[PDB]
Design a binder for this molecule. Sequence first.
Ligand SMILES: CCCCCCCCCCCCCCCCCC(=O)OC[C@H](COP(=O)(O)OCCN)OC(=O)CCCCCCCCCCCCCCCCC
Ligand SMILES: CCCCCCCCCCCCCCCCCC(=O)OC[C@H](COP(=O)(O)OCCN)OC(=O)CCCCCCCCCCCCCCCCC
Ligand SMILES: CCCCCCCCCCCCCCCCCC(=O)OC[C@H](COP(=O)(O)OCCN)OC(=O)CCCCCCCCCCCCCCCCC
Ligand SMILES: CCCCCCCCCCCCCCCCCC(=O)OC[C@H](COP(=O)(O)OCCN)OC(=O)CCCCCCCCCCCCCCCCC
Ligand SMILES: CCCCCCCCCCCCCCCCCC(=O)OC[C@H](COP(=O)(O)OCCN)OC(=O)CCCCCCCCCCCCCCCCC
Ligand SMILES: CCCCCCCCCCCCCCCCCC(=O)OC[C@H](COP(=O)(O)OCCN)OC(=O)CCCCCCCCCCCCCCCCC
Ligand SMILES: CCCCCCCCCCCCCCCCCCCC
Lengths: 605, 504
Amino acid sequence: MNMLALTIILPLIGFVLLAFSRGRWSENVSAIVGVGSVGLAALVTAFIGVDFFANGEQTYSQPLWTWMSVGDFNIGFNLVLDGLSLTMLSVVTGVGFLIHMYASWYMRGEEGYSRFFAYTNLFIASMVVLVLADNLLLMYLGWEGVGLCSYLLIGFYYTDPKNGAAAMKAFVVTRVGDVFLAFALFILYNELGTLNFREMVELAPAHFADGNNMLMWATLMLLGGAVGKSAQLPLQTWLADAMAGPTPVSALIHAATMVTAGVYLIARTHGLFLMTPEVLHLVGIVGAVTLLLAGFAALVQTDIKRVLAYSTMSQIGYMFLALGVQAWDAAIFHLMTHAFFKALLFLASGSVILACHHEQNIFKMGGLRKSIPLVYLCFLVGGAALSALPLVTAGFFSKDEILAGAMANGHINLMVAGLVGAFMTSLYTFRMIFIVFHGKEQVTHSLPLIVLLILSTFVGALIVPPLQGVLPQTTELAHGSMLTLEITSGVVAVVGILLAAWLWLGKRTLVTSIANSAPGRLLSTWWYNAWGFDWLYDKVFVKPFLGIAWLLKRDPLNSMMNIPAVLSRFAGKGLLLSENGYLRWYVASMSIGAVVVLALLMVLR
Amino acid sequence: MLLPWLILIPFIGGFLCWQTERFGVKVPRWIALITMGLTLALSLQLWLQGGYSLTQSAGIPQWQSEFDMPWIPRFGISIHLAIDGLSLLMVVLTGLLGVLAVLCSWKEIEKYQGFFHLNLMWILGGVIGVFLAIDMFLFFFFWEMMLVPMYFLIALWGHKASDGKTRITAATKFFIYTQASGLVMLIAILALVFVHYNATGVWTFNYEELLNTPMSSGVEYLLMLGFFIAFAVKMPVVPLHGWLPDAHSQAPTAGSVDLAGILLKTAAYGLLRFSLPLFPNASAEFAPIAMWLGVIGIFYGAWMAFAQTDIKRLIAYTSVSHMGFVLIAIYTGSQLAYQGAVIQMIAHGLSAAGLFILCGQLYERIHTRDMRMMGGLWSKMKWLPALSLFFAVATLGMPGTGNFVGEFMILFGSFQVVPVITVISTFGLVFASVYSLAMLHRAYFGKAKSQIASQELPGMSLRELFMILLLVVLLVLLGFYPQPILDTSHSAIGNIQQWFVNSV
Ligand SMILES: CCCCCCCCCCCCCCCCCC(=O)OC[C@H](COP(=O)(O)OCCN)OC(=O)CCCCCCCCCCCCCCCCC
Ligand SMILES: CCCCCCCCCCCCCCCCCC(=O)OC[C@H](COP(=O)(O)OCCN)OC(=O)CCCCCCCCCCCCCCCCC
Ligand SMILES: CCCCCCCCCCCCCCCCCC(=O)OC[C@H](COP(=O)(O)OCCN)OC(=O)CCCCCCCCCCCCCCCCC
Ligand SMILES: CCCCCCCCCCCCCCCCCC(=O)OC[C@H](COP(=O)(O)OCCN)OC(=O)CCCCCCCCCCCCCCCCC
Ligand SMILES: CCCCCCCCCCCCCCCCCC(=O)OC[C@H](COP(=O)(O)OCCN)OC(=O)CCCCCCCCCCCCCCCCC
Ligand SMILES: CCCCCCCCCCCCCCCCCC(=O)OC[C@H](COP(=O)(O)OCCN)OC(=O)CCCCCCCCCCCCCCCCC
Ligand SMILES: CCCCCCCCCCCCCCCCCCCC
C-alpha cells in the first residue's frame, strides 16, 4: 500500500525516458518502455487494491512533502486512497494499459513513436495525480496536466493545421473550465481556510450556518469546472473538433481519462453539493440537456469518430444526471462500464479505420462484417453495451441503476429524459453500426480487444466498486417499480434497435424522404453543427477577440505616449524659424524682449 | 561586509574584461565567466550563512547584513547597503541571469568584445546595487547608472540585420523613458528629504530615517506618484510600456542584454521596498488605480502578444502581462499575494530568460524572426522546439512550473482582498494560454511557409543545451518545491506587509 506514489513515478520515468530518447531508440524498445511503465502502474494498482481489500477498506493517506506553507495557507503533497480513488485509479491504469498495448501495435511505422508514448505516459501520471489528490490544489495540478497532455495528444499530427486548431480549441475551452474551477478554489479557501476534501466537508456546515451564498457560488464554479472538463453544457464544443487525433488518444480521452474528471470532481466533493441542493439539481439538469443534445447531434452525423464522440458526451450526461439525482454509486459504476465499452468501441473503430485504408465517412463504408469478423463482433458488443441491451451487457445494469436512482428520489422529468436519451442512443448507435457494417462491399492488438470484449459484457457489471462508506447510499426503489423500470428500459432499447433496423438495415427510402425534406434538412443541418453552439462561441468570443487584436496590433498607447515626442519635434521646428540669421531681426527681438520685460515688471509691481 | 564586494566584483571584472583583450580575443569571455561565477558563489554563500529560514518578522528595518560608509556627508548621503531575504533572492537571480548572459555570448569573437563584456558587467553591477542599496540617493544612482551600458549595447552591438537608425531610436526611447522617470523619482526623493529636514532638522537620505516622516495627505500622494511613475516606466505598466518591445526588438542577437538588466524586475522590488513602507496611506488610497492599471496591463499585453508577428515582441508583451499580475499583487496588502508576487517574479525571470535564449538560438539557425516565414520546425530541429514548448507551457501558468505557483498565490491573496480583479485576472490567464498556443503553433507546428524553414538545421551546442536544461530543472524544482524560496523571503514580506497594514 506504501507504493501509492509508484503509480505516478513509473509513468513519469517512462515519459522522461521517452522524451529524452528523441526517437533514437528502436520502436520495439520505445514500445517496451511505454507499455511497461503503464503495465507496472497497473500491477502496482492491483497490489494496492489487494492490500486495500485486505485492510478492510480503510482510507489510506500518504504524504510526501508540503507544497506551500505561507501562514495559514498550507497546501501539502499528500495522496489519498478510498474506494472512489481506487476505482478511478484501477480504471485509468487498466484501460490505459490496454490502450497502450493497442497503440504499440497501432503506431507502428509512424513518426513520433516515443513522443506519443511519452505524452500518453505523462497523461497517465497526471490522471493518477488527479484521482489520488486529497486537496483541491493538487487535484488542480493533475487537472491542468491532464488538459496539457490532451492538448499535446490531440494535435499529434502537427503537419496538418486543422489538428493544431482543434488542439487550440480543446485547450482554450478546458482552460476556461479550469479558471471556473480556480474560482471555486478561491472561494472555498477564502471561506473555510483549507482545500483538503475531508477538512472542507468538516468545517463547511459550521462556517456556513448563517450564510450559504458563498458555498452555493463555490459549488456552482465547481460545476462549471466539471462541465469544462467533462464536455458538458456550456463548454462541450471542443470534443467533436478535437476528435482529429489518433485512435488511442481518442480512447484514452473519451473512455479512460479526460471526460471522467468532472464526474470524479462532483463525486469527490459530494458533501458540498449535498448542502447546496439547487446546484446539485442544476448538475442533473445540465446532464439531462447535454445527453439529449448529444444524442440528437449523433443521430445525423456522417463520421464514426464524431458519432462515438457525441455518444461519449451523452454517456457523461448520463453520469451527470446520476450525480444530480444523488445516485453517486450508479454514476461511478456507469463510469467504469462506459470506460470499458467506449475503449472497446474506439479501438475497434481504429481497427476499422486501418482496414478501410484511411476512410472516415460512414456512407462510403459498406459490408465490413465479411472482411473483418473480429472487429465486427467488437463493434456489435460495444454498441450493445452502449445501447443498454438487457441482461447481457454492463451498460444495461449501469443505466438501470442510474434510472432507478433517479426514480426513487422523486425526479420524474430527469428519468423521462434518460429514457428518451436511451432510445436515441440505441437509435444512433445501431444506425451507425448498420450503415458501416451492412450493405454492398466497395497478439499485441488482439489481447486488449478480447479483454475489453469480456469487460463490455455482464462480466464488467460483475465488478462492483467499493464505494460503500465513501459515497452515500442511494434510496432503494420498490420491487414492482424497479421491475417495471427495467422492463420499460429494455423495451425502449429493443424498440430503438428494431426501428433502426427498420430505417437503415434495408434500403433507406423513407430515411431519404426525411433527410431531403425542408424541415428535415433544417433539422439535420442544425444537429450536425452541435445546435449552433460552436457558431455562437465563434461569433461571441473568437471574432471580437480577433477584431480587438487586429485593432490593437499597432499599439495605440505607444502612439499616445509618443504624441509628446512629435509635439517636441514640431515645437523645435517652429522655434528654429526665429534663427533666420538676420541681424536686424535680432535687434528687433532684443527690443521686443525689452518691451515684454518692462511691461511685465510694470504689471506685476 | 560582502555586499560592497558583491557590487564591486562585476565592475572590477568588467575593467579586467576590457583590459585583458590585448592578451587575446578569446580571453574576456572567460574573465566575465569567472566574474559572475564569483558573484554567484558569494550570493549562495550569503544564502547559506544568512539563516533566512529561521528569521522571524521583527518590523522594518530588519536587515540580515548591513554596510555603511559616508559618501556625501554634506547631504547626509552614505553608501549604505543592506541585504535581507527578498534582496538576497533578487541578487541570486541577478547572478544566475548574468552567468546565463555570459554563457549565451560565448561564440562572439568580435574585435571589440571587451567593451561589450564590460558593459554587461556594469549593467549587472548596477542591478545588484539597485537590489542592495537602502540609501535613496545611492538607489537612484544605481537606477540611472545601469542604463548607460544598456543604451550603448542596444545601439552598437544590437540586432545586426536591422538598420542602425532603428537601434539608435529604440535605445534612445528606452533611455528617455527610464531617465525621465528616474528624474521624477529624484524629485520625489528630494521633496521627501526636504519634508523630513523641515520636520526634524537633520540632513539624511537613509531609507530607515525617512520612514518616520510626518506628511500631510496629498503631499504623500505626490511623492508616491513620483515613485510609482518611475517604477511603472521600468516595470513596465501601461501606457509606459512600448520601450520594452522596442528595446527587445533591437537587442543583440545573442540575448545577453535581455538577461542582464531588462529581464530583472527591479521596479517591483522598489514598489515593495520603497513605495509601500514610505507612503502606506497614499498607497492604500492609490491601490484601486494601480490594480486596475495592472488588469489593463495584463489584457493589453495579452492582446499585443497575440497580434505580434515577431517572437521577441511577443515575449516582451508576455513580460508586460506577468508584470501586470505582479502589480495587482503588490497593492493587495496580503502576505500570501506578496509571497506569490516574489515567486512569480523569480519564475517569470527564469521562463522569459529561457524563451529569449531559445529565440536567439532559433534566429541563429533560421536567420529570421518573422513568424510567417517559419512553421513545422519540429521535424527540422533536434532539441529546440521541445524546450520552447516547455517554456511556452511554463509562461501560461502550468502546474509543475513556478509561474503557476506564483500566479495562484497572487490570485488567492487578491481574492482574499478583492474578488473582481481576481476573476478578471484569471480570465487574463486564459488569454495568456491563448497567446502561448498561438506562438507555439505559428512557430513550430504546421507546414513550412518559406524555404529556409524547409531545410535541416544543426543542433544546439552542449553548453547551450546545458544552460537551457539547467533553466528547465530550476523551473520544475520551483514549481514542485517552492518552499525554500518561500522561507527565504518570509521575513521581508512579513515586515513589509505589517508596516503597510499597521500604518493605514
Ligand atoms: C506530481 C507527481 C507526483 C510526485 C513525484 C514527482 C514530482 C516531481 C519531481 C521533480 C521535483 C521534486 C521535488 C521534491 C523532491 C523531494 C524533496 C522533498 O520534497 O523533500 C521533502 C520531504 C522531507 O521533508 P519534510 O519535512 O518531510 O517535508 C515538508 C517540507 N518542509 O521529502 C520526503 O518526505 C521524501 C519524498 C520523496 C519523493 C520522491 C519522488 C521521486 C520522483 C521522481 C520523478 C522523476 C521525474 C522528474 C521529472 C518529471 C517531469 C516534470
Ligand atoms: C508530474 C506528474 C504529472 C502532473 C502534471 C504535470 C504537468 C506539467 C509537466 C511539465 C513538464 C513538461 C511537459 C511537456 C514537455 C514536452 C516535451 C516534448 O515534447 O518532448 C518530446 C521531445 C522528443 O520528441 P521527438 O519529436 O521524438 O524529438 C524531437 C525531434 N528530434 O523531447 C525532446 O526533444 C527532449 C526533451 C525535451 C524536454 C522534455 C521535458 C522537460 C521538462 C520535464 C523534465 C525536467 C527535468 C527532470 C528533472 C527535474 C528536476 C528533478
Ligand atoms: C460557454 C458559455 C459561458 C462562457 C464561458 C467563457 C467563454 C468560453 C468560450 C468557449 C469557446 C472558445 C473557442 C476558442 C477557439 C480557439 C481555437 C481557434 O479558433 O483557433 C483559431 C485561431 C488560430 O490562431 P492563428 O494561428 O493566429 O490563426 C489565425 C487564423 N487565420 O485562433 C484564434 O482565432 C484565437 C481564438 C481566441 C479565443 C479567445 C477566447 C476568450 C474567452 C474569454 C472568456 C470571457 C468570460 C466572460 C464572458 C462574459 C460574461 C458576462
Ligand atoms: C504617466 C504619464 C506622466 C508621467 C510621465 C513621466 C515621464 C517618463 C515616461 C514618459 C516618457 C515619454 C517619452 C516619449 C518619447 C520617447 C523618445 C522617442 O520617441 O525618441 C525617438 C524620437 C526620434 O525617432 P524618429 O522619429 O525615428 O527620428 C527621426 C526623425 N528625424 O525622438 C524624438 O522625436 C525627439 C525626442 C525628444 C525628447 C523626448 C520627449 C520629451 C517630452 C517630455 C518628457 C517628460 C514627460 C512630461 C509629460 C509628458 C506627457 C505625459
Ligand atoms: C514633468 C515631470 C515632473 C513634474 C512637474 C514638477 C513637480 C510638480 C510638483 C507639484 C507640487 C504641487 C504642490 C502644491 C501645494 C504647495 C503648497 C503646500 O501645500 O505646501 C505644503 C508643504 C509646505 O508646508 P509645510 O509646513 O512644509 O508642511 C509639511 C506638509 N507635509 O509642502 C511641502 O512640504 C513640500 C510639498 C512637495 C510636494 C511634492 C512635489 C514633488 C512630487 C513628485 C513629482 C510630481 C508628481 C509626480 C509626477 C506628476 C506627473 C508628471
Ligand atoms: C513639451 C510639452 C509636452 C511635455 C510636457 C507635458 C506636461 C508636463 C507636466 C505634467 C504635470 C503637471 C503637474 C501635475 C501635478 C500637479 C500637482 C498639483 O496640482 O497638486 C495640488 C495638490 C497638492 O496637494 P496639497 O493639497 O498641497 O496637499 C496638502 C494638503 N492636503 O495635489 C493634491 O492634492 C493631489 C492631486 C493628485 C492628482 C494630480 C496628479 C496627477 C498625476 C498624473 C500622472 C499620474 C497618473 C497616475 C498614474 C498613471 C500611470 C503611471
Ligand atoms: C533564486 C533562484 C531560484 C531557483 C529555483 C529554486 C527552487 C527551489 C529548489 C530547492 C531544491 C529542491 C530539490 C532538493 C530538495 C532537498 C530537500 C532537503 C530537505 C529534506
